[PDB]
Design a protein around this nucleic acid. Structure first.
Length: 167
RNA sequence: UUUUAUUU
């Protein structure tokens, strides 16, 4: 992209100043905002940082992505243009082979469009896949095509069919 | 039904 970044998985405790302070260390910022609920005013867990120099936006991703703050591992990536087309493109998937890895889940779903995030939920005990997860596409239309194409289908080698629906 | 919460 260029100069605008979206930072996800920010801890609920991180303030607007600590946010600007953390990213301001990379280089000059034209603007940045820790997004908060319109009514409660509480952090929504993500924010945006727009640098003056695109080289610093690149440095921010290279140096800050994966930084562990409190219980989170933040993600820093390029913010795609604010368009209604990228909204509601999150899918909840279930019935996946428990042997399936995130790499395979994304290869399966990538046929339908650019994947923003993907995750396989694991048992909060032994760490065994639950065969359930999420896939967030770039465009809502791509998620629509993935539902039509994969909902109720059996992914190569799978003995059981998977379920795909909007989160 | 997520590192609850990826477009201010």
């Amino acid at each position: 992209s260029k100069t605008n970044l979206i930072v996800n998985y920010l801890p609920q405790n991180m303030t607007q100043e600590e946010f600007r302070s953390l990213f301001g260390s990379i280089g000059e910022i034209e603007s940045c905002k820790l997004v908060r609920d319109k009514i409660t005013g509480q952090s929504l867990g993500y924010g945006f940082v727009n640098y003056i120099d695109p080289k610093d936006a690149e440095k921010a991703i290279n140096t800050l992505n994966g930084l562990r703050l409190q219980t989170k591992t933040i993600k820093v990536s390029y913010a795609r243009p604010s368009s209604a087309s990228i909204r509601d493109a999150n899918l909840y998937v279930s019935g996946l082979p428990k042997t399936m890895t995130q790499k395979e889940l994304e290869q399966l779903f990538s046929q339908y469009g650019r994947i923003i995030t993907s995750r396989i939920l694991v048992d909060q005990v032994t760490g065994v896949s639950r065969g359930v997860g999420f896939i967030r596409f770039d465009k809502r239309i791509e998620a629509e095509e993935a539902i039509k194409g994969l909902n109720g289908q059996k992914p190569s080698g799978a003995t059981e069919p998977i379920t795909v629906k909007f989160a």
